[PDB]
Write a protein that binds this ligand. Structure first.
Ligand SMILES: Nc1ncnc2c1ncn2[C@@H]1O[C@H](C[C@@H](N)CC[C@H](N)C(=O)O)[C@@H](O)[C@H]1O
Length: 277
Protein backbone atom coordinates (compact mmCIF):
# COMPACT_ATOMS: atom_id res chain seq x y z
CA UNK A 1 0.00 0.00 0.00
CA UNK A 2 2.74 2.50 0.94
CA UNK A 3 5.60 3.39 -1.43
CA UNK A 4 7.94 2.11 1.30
CA UNK A 5 6.23 -1.30 1.19
CA UNK A 6 6.59 -1.37 -2.60
CA UNK A 7 10.29 -0.52 -2.16
CA UNK A 8 10.80 -3.40 0.26
CA UNK A 9 9.00 -6.04 -1.87
CA UNK A 10 11.05 -4.97 -4.92
CA UNK A 11 14.31 -4.97 -2.95
CA UNK A 12 13.91 -8.64 -2.08
CA UNK A 13 13.21 -9.60 -5.70
CA UNK A 14 16.50 -8.15 -7.00
CA UNK A 15 19.24 -10.55 -8.14
CA UNK A 16 22.60 -10.88 -6.40
CA UNK A 17 24.42 -8.51 -8.80
CA UNK A 18 21.40 -6.16 -9.02
CA UNK A 19 21.06 -5.91 -5.23
CA UNK A 20 24.77 -5.15 -4.79
CA UNK A 21 24.69 -2.49 -7.54
CA UNK A 22 21.52 -0.95 -6.08
CA UNK A 23 22.70 -0.96 -2.45
CA UNK A 24 25.49 1.56 -3.08
CA UNK A 25 23.89 3.64 -5.88
CA UNK A 26 24.44 7.37 -5.28
CA UNK A 27 24.98 6.86 -1.52
CA UNK A 28 27.85 8.36 0.46
CA UNK A 29 30.40 5.92 1.89
CA UNK A 30 33.46 6.17 4.14
CA UNK A 31 36.57 4.18 3.23
CA UNK A 32 36.99 1.81 6.17
CA UNK A 33 40.21 0.16 4.92
CA UNK A 34 42.61 1.78 7.42
CA UNK A 35 40.32 1.43 10.45
CA UNK A 36 39.60 -2.24 9.70
CA UNK A 37 43.35 -2.96 9.46
CA UNK A 38 44.12 -1.34 12.82
CA UNK A 39 41.17 -3.18 14.41
CA UNK A 40 42.31 -6.65 13.26
CA UNK A 41 45.90 -5.74 14.21
CA UNK A 42 44.41 -4.72 17.58
CA UNK A 43 46.00 -1.27 17.82
CA UNK A 44 44.67 1.12 20.46
CA UNK A 45 47.06 3.93 19.67
CA UNK A 46 45.46 5.13 16.45
CA UNK A 47 42.46 7.48 16.49
CA UNK A 48 40.09 5.36 14.40
CA UNK A 49 36.32 4.93 14.67
CA UNK A 50 35.29 1.42 15.83
CA UNK A 51 32.40 1.21 13.29
CA UNK A 52 31.02 2.60 10.02
CA UNK A 53 28.15 4.01 12.14
CA UNK A 54 30.25 6.95 13.35
CA UNK A 55 29.91 8.46 9.84
CA UNK A 56 26.13 8.76 10.33
CA UNK A 57 26.35 10.67 13.63
CA UNK A 58 29.16 12.89 12.28
CA UNK A 59 26.92 13.86 9.33
CA UNK A 60 23.94 14.61 11.58
CA UNK A 61 26.14 16.64 13.99
CA UNK A 62 28.13 18.52 11.32
CA UNK A 63 24.98 19.37 9.32
CA UNK A 64 23.34 20.81 12.46
CA UNK A 65 20.51 18.26 12.82
CA UNK A 66 21.77 17.43 16.30
CA UNK A 67 23.62 19.34 19.00
CA UNK A 68 25.79 16.94 21.02
CA UNK A 69 26.37 18.31 24.52
CA UNK A 70 26.59 17.69 28.29
CA UNK A 71 25.60 14.25 29.53
CA UNK A 72 25.22 11.97 26.52
CA UNK A 73 23.35 8.66 26.60
CA UNK A 74 23.90 6.05 23.86
CA UNK A 75 21.25 3.33 23.91
CA UNK A 76 22.30 0.30 21.86
CA UNK A 77 25.94 1.46 21.59
CA UNK A 78 27.30 -1.83 20.19
CA UNK A 79 31.03 -1.45 19.51
CA UNK A 80 30.75 2.21 20.55
CA UNK A 81 31.02 4.16 17.27
CA UNK A 82 28.53 6.86 18.33
CA UNK A 83 29.83 6.89 21.94
CA UNK A 84 33.45 7.59 20.98
CA UNK A 85 32.39 10.23 18.43
CA UNK A 86 30.32 12.00 21.11
CA UNK A 87 33.14 11.78 23.68
CA UNK A 88 35.47 13.62 21.28
CA UNK A 89 33.12 16.63 21.05
CA UNK A 90 33.89 20.00 22.69
CA UNK A 91 30.71 20.50 24.71
CA UNK A 92 30.33 16.89 25.90
CA UNK A 93 31.03 16.20 29.60
CA UNK A 94 30.23 12.50 29.91
CA UNK A 95 29.13 9.59 27.75
CA UNK A 96 27.27 6.49 28.94
CA UNK A 97 26.77 3.66 26.44
CA UNK A 98 24.44 0.71 27.05
CA UNK A 99 24.23 -2.45 24.91
CA UNK A 100 23.22 -6.14 24.93
CA UNK A 101 26.60 -7.60 23.96
CA UNK A 102 25.09 -11.09 24.15
CA UNK A 103 25.31 -13.87 21.64
CA UNK A 104 25.38 -12.47 18.15
CA UNK A 105 25.40 -8.85 19.37
CA UNK A 106 28.46 -6.56 19.33
CA UNK A 107 30.28 -5.75 22.57
CA UNK A 108 31.96 -2.36 23.21
CA UNK A 109 35.51 -2.07 21.82
CA UNK A 110 38.26 -0.36 23.83
CA UNK A 111 39.78 2.60 22.00
CA UNK A 112 41.62 5.75 23.07
CA UNK A 113 40.18 8.39 20.78
CA UNK A 114 39.81 11.81 22.42
CA UNK A 115 37.73 11.77 25.61
CA UNK A 116 37.91 7.97 26.04
CA UNK A 117 38.26 8.75 29.74
CA UNK A 118 34.72 10.25 29.90
CA UNK A 119 33.07 7.22 28.24
CA UNK A 120 31.61 4.41 30.34
CA UNK A 121 30.17 1.29 28.71
CA UNK A 122 27.90 -1.31 30.22
CA UNK A 123 27.07 -4.46 28.29
CA UNK A 124 24.43 -7.09 29.29
CA UNK A 125 22.05 -4.14 29.37
CA UNK A 126 18.59 -4.23 27.84
CA UNK A 127 17.68 -0.56 27.21
CA UNK A 128 13.96 -1.45 26.88
CA UNK A 129 13.74 -2.73 30.48
CA UNK A 130 16.64 -1.21 32.46
CA UNK A 131 16.21 1.85 34.74
CA UNK A 132 16.41 5.22 32.91
CA UNK A 133 18.68 8.16 33.79
CA UNK A 134 18.85 11.82 32.73
CA UNK A 135 20.67 12.99 29.61
CA UNK A 136 21.10 16.29 27.80
CA UNK A 137 21.68 14.37 24.57
CA UNK A 138 19.93 11.03 24.04
CA UNK A 139 21.13 8.80 21.20
CA UNK A 140 19.63 5.49 20.06
CA UNK A 141 20.69 3.59 16.96
CA UNK A 142 18.53 0.50 17.58
CA UNK A 143 16.54 -1.13 14.79
CA UNK A 144 17.33 -4.58 13.45
CA UNK A 145 16.19 -5.34 9.89
CA UNK A 146 13.94 -8.28 8.98
CA UNK A 147 12.46 -9.77 5.79
CA UNK A 148 9.08 -9.45 7.51
CA UNK A 149 7.96 -5.78 7.28
CA UNK A 150 5.54 -6.23 10.21
CA UNK A 151 8.46 -7.35 12.40
CA UNK A 152 10.28 -4.15 11.34
CA UNK A 153 7.14 -2.09 12.10
CA UNK A 154 6.93 -3.51 15.63
CA UNK A 155 10.69 -3.10 16.24
CA UNK A 156 10.54 0.58 15.16
CA UNK A 157 7.53 1.12 17.45
CA UNK A 158 9.43 -0.38 20.40
CA UNK A 159 12.41 1.92 19.79
CA UNK A 160 10.16 5.03 19.67
CA UNK A 161 8.22 3.97 22.80
CA UNK A 162 11.45 3.36 24.71
CA UNK A 163 12.79 6.76 23.55
CA UNK A 164 9.78 8.39 25.23
CA UNK A 165 10.46 6.33 28.38
CA UNK A 166 14.10 7.51 28.57
CA UNK A 167 13.52 11.14 27.56
CA UNK A 168 13.86 13.52 30.53
CA UNK A 169 12.80 17.17 30.81
CA UNK A 170 16.42 18.24 30.09
CA UNK A 171 16.78 15.94 27.06
CA UNK A 172 16.74 18.78 24.51
CA UNK A 173 18.93 16.95 22.01
CA UNK A 174 18.15 13.54 20.55
CA UNK A 175 18.73 11.21 17.62
CA UNK A 176 16.67 8.02 17.37
CA UNK A 177 16.83 5.45 14.56
CA UNK A 178 13.50 4.88 12.80
CA UNK A 179 14.09 1.52 11.05
CA UNK A 180 10.87 1.39 9.00
CA UNK A 181 9.45 4.93 8.92
CA UNK A 182 6.81 4.32 6.22
CA UNK A 183 4.33 2.21 8.22
CA UNK A 184 1.19 4.27 9.05
CA UNK A 185 1.58 3.32 12.77
CA UNK A 186 5.15 4.67 12.79
CA UNK A 187 4.15 7.90 11.00
CA UNK A 188 1.38 8.38 13.56
CA UNK A 189 3.78 7.76 16.50
CA UNK A 190 6.35 10.21 15.10
CA UNK A 191 3.67 12.82 14.44
CA UNK A 192 2.48 12.48 18.05
CA UNK A 193 6.05 12.69 19.40
CA UNK A 194 6.64 15.80 17.29
CA UNK A 195 3.51 17.41 18.79
CA UNK A 196 5.18 17.16 22.21
CA UNK A 197 8.94 17.38 21.55
CA UNK A 198 9.23 19.06 18.15
CA UNK A 199 12.08 17.89 15.94
CA UNK A 200 11.81 16.15 12.60
CA UNK A 201 12.89 13.17 10.55
CA UNK A 202 15.92 12.90 8.27
CA UNK A 203 17.54 10.49 5.83
CA UNK A 204 21.31 10.14 6.33
CA UNK A 205 23.09 9.78 2.93
CA UNK A 206 25.47 7.19 4.48
CA UNK A 207 22.54 4.77 4.85
CA UNK A 208 22.59 2.07 2.14
CA UNK A 209 19.67 1.92 -0.34
CA UNK A 210 18.93 -1.53 1.14
CA UNK A 211 17.47 0.13 4.27
CA UNK A 212 14.69 2.71 4.56
CA UNK A 213 16.10 3.83 7.97
CA UNK A 214 15.68 7.48 8.91
CA UNK A 215 16.53 9.41 12.10
CA UNK A 216 14.19 11.33 14.40
CA UNK A 217 16.29 14.34 15.38
CA UNK A 218 16.00 17.41 17.62
CA UNK A 219 17.73 20.06 15.49
CA UNK A 220 15.27 20.51 12.61
CA UNK A 221 11.50 20.75 12.17
CA UNK A 222 9.84 19.16 9.15
CA UNK A 223 6.73 17.43 7.82
CA UNK A 224 7.03 13.73 8.77
CA UNK A 225 4.80 12.34 5.95
CA UNK A 226 6.55 14.57 3.41
CA UNK A 227 10.12 13.58 4.45
CA UNK A 228 9.26 9.86 4.50
CA UNK A 229 7.46 9.98 1.11
CA UNK A 230 10.42 11.92 -0.38
CA UNK A 231 12.83 9.21 0.83
CA UNK A 232 10.56 6.45 -0.51
CA UNK A 233 10.47 8.16 -3.93
CA UNK A 234 14.28 8.59 -3.90
CA UNK A 235 14.85 4.90 -3.04
CA UNK A 236 12.41 3.88 -5.81
CA UNK A 237 13.99 6.32 -8.30
CA UNK A 238 17.46 4.94 -7.51
CA UNK A 239 16.12 1.39 -8.01
CA UNK A 240 14.81 2.20 -11.54
CA UNK A 241 18.14 3.81 -12.52
CA UNK A 242 20.97 2.44 -10.33
CA UNK A 243 24.35 4.19 -10.84
CA UNK A 244 26.18 1.43 -8.94
CA UNK A 245 28.56 4.15 -7.72
CA UNK A 246 28.90 5.53 -4.19
CA UNK A 247 30.48 8.88 -3.26
CA UNK A 248 33.55 8.04 -1.17
CA UNK A 249 34.40 10.29 1.80
CA UNK A 250 37.16 10.23 4.41
CA UNK A 251 36.56 8.04 7.46
CA UNK A 252 35.88 9.38 10.97
CA UNK A 253 39.40 9.89 12.25
CA UNK A 254 39.76 11.41 15.68
CA UNK A 255 42.66 12.72 17.77
CA UNK A 256 43.56 10.57 20.76
CA UNK A 257 43.84 11.47 24.43
CA UNK A 258 42.09 12.20 27.69
CA UNK A 259 39.86 15.24 28.24
CA UNK A 260 39.68 17.42 31.35
CA UNK A 261 36.45 18.99 30.07
CA UNK A 262 35.92 18.77 37.65
CA UNK A 263 38.10 15.97 39.11
CA UNK A 264 41.66 15.32 37.90
CA UNK A 265 42.05 12.14 35.81
CA UNK A 266 41.66 9.00 37.93
CA UNK A 267 44.10 6.79 35.99
CA UNK A 268 43.73 3.97 38.56
CA UNK A 269 39.95 3.74 37.99
CA UNK A 270 40.54 4.19 34.25
CA UNK A 271 42.83 1.13 34.09
CA UNK A 272 40.17 -1.01 35.82
CA UNK A 273 37.48 0.24 33.44
CA UNK A 274 39.71 -0.60 30.45
CA UNK A 275 40.59 -3.98 32.06
CA UNK A 276 36.90 -4.91 32.21
CA UNK A 277 36.27 -3.86 28.57
N1 LIG B 1 17.21 -3.77 23.74
C1 LIG B 1 18.50 -3.47 23.54
N2 LIG B 1 19.28 -3.06 24.56
C2 LIG B 1 20.56 -2.77 24.37
N3 LIG B 1 21.13 -2.88 23.17
C3 LIG B 1 20.41 -3.28 22.12
C4 LIG B 1 19.07 -3.60 22.28
N4 LIG B 1 18.61 -3.97 21.09
C5 LIG B 1 19.62 -3.90 20.22
N5 LIG B 1 20.72 -3.49 20.85
C6 LIG B 1 22.06 -3.24 20.26
O1 LIG B 1 21.87 -2.04 19.51
C7 LIG B 1 22.99 -1.96 18.60
C8 LIG B 1 22.57 -1.15 17.35
C9 LIG B 1 23.76 -0.77 16.43
N6 LIG B 1 23.19 -0.39 15.12
C10 LIG B 1 24.51 0.42 17.02
C11 LIG B 1 25.77 0.83 16.22
C12 LIG B 1 26.50 1.98 16.92
N7 LIG B 1 25.73 3.23 16.79
C13 LIG B 1 27.90 2.20 16.32
O2 LIG B 1 28.08 3.29 15.74
O3 LIG B 1 28.76 1.30 16.47
C14 LIG B 1 23.38 -3.42 18.30
O4 LIG B 1 24.74 -3.59 18.68
C15 LIG B 1 22.47 -4.25 19.20
O5 LIG B 1 23.21 -5.30 19.83
Amino acid sequence: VTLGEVWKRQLNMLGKQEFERYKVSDITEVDRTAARRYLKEGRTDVGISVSRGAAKIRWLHERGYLRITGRVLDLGCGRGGWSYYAAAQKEVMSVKGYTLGIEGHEKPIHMQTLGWNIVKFKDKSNVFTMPTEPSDTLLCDIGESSSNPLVERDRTMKVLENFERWKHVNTENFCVKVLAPYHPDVIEKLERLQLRFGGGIVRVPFSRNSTHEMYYISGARNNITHMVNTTSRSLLRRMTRPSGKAIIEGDVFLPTGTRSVAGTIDHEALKLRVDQI
